[PDB]
Amino acid sequence: MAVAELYTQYNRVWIPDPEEVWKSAEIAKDYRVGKVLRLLLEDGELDYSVNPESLPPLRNPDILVGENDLTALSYLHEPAVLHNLRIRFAESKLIYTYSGIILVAMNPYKQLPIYGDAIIHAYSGQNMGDMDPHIFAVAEEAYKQMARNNRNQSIIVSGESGAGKTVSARYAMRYFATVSKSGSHVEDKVLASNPITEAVGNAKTTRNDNSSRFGKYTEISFDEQNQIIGANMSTYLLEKSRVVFQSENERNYHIFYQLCASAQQSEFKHLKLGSAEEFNYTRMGGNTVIEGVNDRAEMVETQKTFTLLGFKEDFQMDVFKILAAILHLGNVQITAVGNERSSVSEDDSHLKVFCELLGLESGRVAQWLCNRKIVTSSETVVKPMTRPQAVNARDALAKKIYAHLFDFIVERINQALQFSGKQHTFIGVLDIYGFETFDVNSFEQFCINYANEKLQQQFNMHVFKLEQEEYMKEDIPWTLIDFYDNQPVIDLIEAKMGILELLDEECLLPHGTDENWLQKLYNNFVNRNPLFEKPRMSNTSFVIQHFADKVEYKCEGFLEKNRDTVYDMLVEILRASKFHLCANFFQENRTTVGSKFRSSLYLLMETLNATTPHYVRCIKPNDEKLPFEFDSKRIVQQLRACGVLETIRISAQSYPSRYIEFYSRYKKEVCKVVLHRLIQDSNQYQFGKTKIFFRGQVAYLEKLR
Numbered sequence: 252m253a254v255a256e257l258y259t260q261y262n263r264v265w266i267p268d269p270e271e272v273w274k275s276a277e278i279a280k281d282y283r284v285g286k287v288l289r290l291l292l293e294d295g296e297l298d299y300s301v302n303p304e305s306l307p308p309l310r311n312p313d314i315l316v317g318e319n320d321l322t323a324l325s326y327l328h329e330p331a332v333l334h335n336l337r338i339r340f341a342e343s344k345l346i347y348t349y350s351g352i353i354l355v356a357m358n359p360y361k362q363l364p365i366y367g368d369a370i371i372h373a374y375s376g377q378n379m380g381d382m383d384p385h386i387f388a389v390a391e392e393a394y395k396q397m398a399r400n401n402r403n404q405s406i407i408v409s410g411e412s413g414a415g416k417t418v419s420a421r422y423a424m425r426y427f428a429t430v431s432k433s434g435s436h437v438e439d440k441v442l443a444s445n446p447i448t449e450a451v452g453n454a455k456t457t458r459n460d461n462s463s464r465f466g467k468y469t470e471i472s473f474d475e476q477n478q479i480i481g482a483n484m485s486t487y488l489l490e491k492s493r494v495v496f497q498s499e500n501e502r503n504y505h506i507f508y509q510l511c512a513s514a515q516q517s518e519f520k521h522l523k524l525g526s527a528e529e530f531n532y533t534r535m536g537g538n539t540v541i542e543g544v545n546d547r548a549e550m551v552e553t554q555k556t557f558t559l560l561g562f563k564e565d566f567q568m569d570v571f572k573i574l575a576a577i578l579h580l581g582n583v584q585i586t587a588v589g590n591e592r593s594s595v596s597e598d599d600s601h602l603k604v605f606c607e608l609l610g611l612e613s614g615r616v617a618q619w620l621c622n623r624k625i626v627t628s629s630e631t632v633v634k635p636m637t638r639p640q641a642v643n644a645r646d647a648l649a650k651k652i653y654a655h656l657f658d659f660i661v662e663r664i665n666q667a668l669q670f671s672g673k674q675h676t677f678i679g680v681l682d683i684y685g686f687e688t689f690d691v692n693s694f695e696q697f698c699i700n701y702a703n704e705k706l707q708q709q710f711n712m713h714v715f716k717l718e719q720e721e722y723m724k725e726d727i728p729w730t731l732i733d734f735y736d737n738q739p740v741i742d743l744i745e746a747k748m749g750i751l752e753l754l755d756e757e758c759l760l761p762h763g764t765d766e767n768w769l770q771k772l773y774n775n776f777v778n779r780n781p782l783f784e785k786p787r788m789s790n791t792s793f794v795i796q797h798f799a800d801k802v803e804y805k806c807e808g809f810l811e812k813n814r815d816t817v818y819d820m821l822v823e824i825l826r827a828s829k830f831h832l833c834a835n836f837f838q839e840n841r842t843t844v845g846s847k848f849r850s851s852l853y854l855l856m857e858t859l860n861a862t863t864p865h866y867v868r869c870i871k872p873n874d875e876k877l878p879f880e881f882d883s884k885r886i887v888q889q890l891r892a893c894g895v896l897e898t899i900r901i902s903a904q905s906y907p908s909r910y911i912e913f914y915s916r917y918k919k920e921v922c923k924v925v926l927h928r929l930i931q932d933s934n935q936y937q938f939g940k941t942k943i944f945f946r947g948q949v950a951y952l953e954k955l956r
């Protein structure tokens with residue numbers, strides 16, 4: 252129709268380019284309705300092959316600065332979004348951009364002076380959209396709605412590893428803490444909870460120098476005057492294998508390096524530590540230092556933060572003792588005796604420190620690192636362990652001790668953040684590990700990536716399903732916006748016949764194996780479920796089509812990691828610990844890791860669904876942690892994965908403000924003909940079965956009051 256009349260001389264379009272995904276091209280001669288199109292490139296010209304139905308994407312008119320909200324784009328398509336963000340990022344140094352209520356945040360990889368108190372208060376009391384896009388605006392909007400509607404809110408940040416979720420979450424929490432002040436100083440303690448959990452919960456990966464290896468949901472509690480009174484942290488599966496293993500250029504958890512960097516301080520001498528390079532549990536990656544990070548200085552800050560939360564020096568030394576003990580455990584020499592047996596010397600210097608610190612008997616530990624007890628009714632058998640088996644038992648114990656320590660710190664943080672008053676409302680801040688893939692992906696990545704699928708599902712259910720259904724039930728004209736439903740890959744993972752259920756099945760077999768489980772995966776899903784693949788050149792791995800990328804998983808270690816057990820005799824020894832904190836960990840007060848995880852995510856998703864969400868979509872602009880560097884191919888891959896274009900389409904098309912409430916606030920044939928004969932714009936508001944939808948057309952009537 253008129254479409255062809257838009258493609259004329261002097262006009263520009265987007266065409267595929269390998270490097271920048273899309274490249275611009277100017278139209279030479281006007282277009283004729285119905286097969287080709289002549290364009291003048293930046294360097295030369297060609298007759299662009301064209302589909303008369305789907306002509307090349309029209310380019311938008313240049314503006315001095317990229318529009319603050321992408322819904323404002325006349326021609327809404329992928330090239331427009333990619334280009335607007337590039338211009339705002341590379342040229343204007345703007346990391347934040349609106350897609351309606353949904354915020355897009357680009358990782359600058361550079362400190363920006365835009366988070367000060369003056370700016371915080373400039374955003375306070377303002378309406379969403381009045382100010383430039385900013386994480387504070389998202390936070391203010393949630394605060395505004397909580398107070399005005401007495402409704403619980405959620406800040407839900409998303410994106411792949413290193414995109415900037417944790418940073419966004421912390422700045423949102425800082426905003427809340429500042430505008431709630433002056434409380435009659437609980438705010439300082441709520442904020443302190445983040446860096447503590449980072450010290451024991453974050454570590455350097457090749458994607459992120461400060462990668463979160465656990466999921467976090469922090470409910471911030473408010474009183475009736477909307478002042479912070481406390482908070483509660485829910486954590487989700489910590490990466491345990493991190494304690495005893497690192498791949499090249501990766502580190503263990505930060506606090507180990509903070510501790511080792513403090514080895515020669517007087518207060519720490521009794522822990523008998525050395526450099527991080529002495530210990531097997533911290534040296535494995537080949538590099539113990541993070542560029543720009545002084546681990547000794549971080550130890551000092553960590554100690555201040557513990558103190559801020561009310562954890563005195565003795566409490567701090569007690570956790571440091573556990574951490575030191577774990578390090579020494581990793582350096583306990585286990586030697587091979589023949590081919591079937593292992594041995595640990597009771598005089599092993601690291602074993603002695605380990606036992607001194609945790610108050611254990613060295614003869615007992617050495618014995619039961621290298622042997623296992625088998626109790627039947629008829630008898631008790633003691634079998635030797637091979638050195639590999641002994642190492643595995645040793646490392647399992649280390650992981651278990653650390654897991655308890657982490658839970659213990661979280662629990663005590665929650666005790667310190669408790670309140671006696673009544674919780675009027677709360678704002679929940681979600682910060683979980685983001686999508687990640689490496690040369691070698693295992694059980695850890697599978698769980699993280701499954702969690703990210705569920706979050707994308709929760710986003711989609713709210714933004715696309717629930718929202719568009721409301722319109723259809725209210726019976727108004729609505730053109731449907733398509734989105735990619737990731738329910739299938741989710742079912743493949745979590746449902747009755749799923750990967751995780753099959754893993755649980757194999758784990759019940761006493762002679763279960765990773766290989767037998769993998770074969771069952773092949774048989775059930777190869778050439779049967781499209782989202783499941785077997786590489787042509789591998790009989791040890793499987794591939795999953797996730798919303799964001801395809802990921803290849805090695806089967807090795809899935810059973811072990813799903814079972815997550817320690818030998819009874821080792822647990823019994825630590826249960827008899829003469830160190831109070833350790834004995835508490837292993838005191839006596841079925842389901843697998845995979846099953847506990849599913850249940851935890853189910854409860855989290857329904858927690859979120861019972862709040863008003865506020866979505867922040869974080870994008871990692873490049874893979875080299877470079878300041879304001881725009882990698883087009885990687886960015887467009889993330890935009891597609893998060894359904895950013897579709898989010899903008901439904902954002903532009905949606906009615907922001909939504910009969911019985913109409914009359915009383917300020918039959919249905921009357922109220923309509925009343926408003927119709929009141930405002931000359933019939934398009935400025937659409938009437939439904941039981942509600943009238945106002946396009947900011949609703950704000951006009953407000954000021955008339």
Ligand SMILES: Nc1ncnc2c1ncn2[C@@H]1O[C@H](COP(=O)(O)OP(=O)(O)O)[C@@H](O)[C@H]1O
Binds near residue numbers: 410413418461869
């Ligand atoms: N707004 C920001 N300002 C400055 N640096 C940032 C910002 N967002 C991210 N970064 C940098 O990127 C790093 C990784 O971000 P992070 O939030 O920890 O990632 P994740 O999404 O995996 O939680 C930050 O620790 C910092 O180096």
Ligand code: VO4
Binds near residue numbers: 413414464683
């Ligand atoms: O690297 V992040 O795990 O914190 O998503």
Ligand SMILES: [Mg+2]
Binds near residue numbers: 417461462463683684
């Ligand atoms: Mg993080």
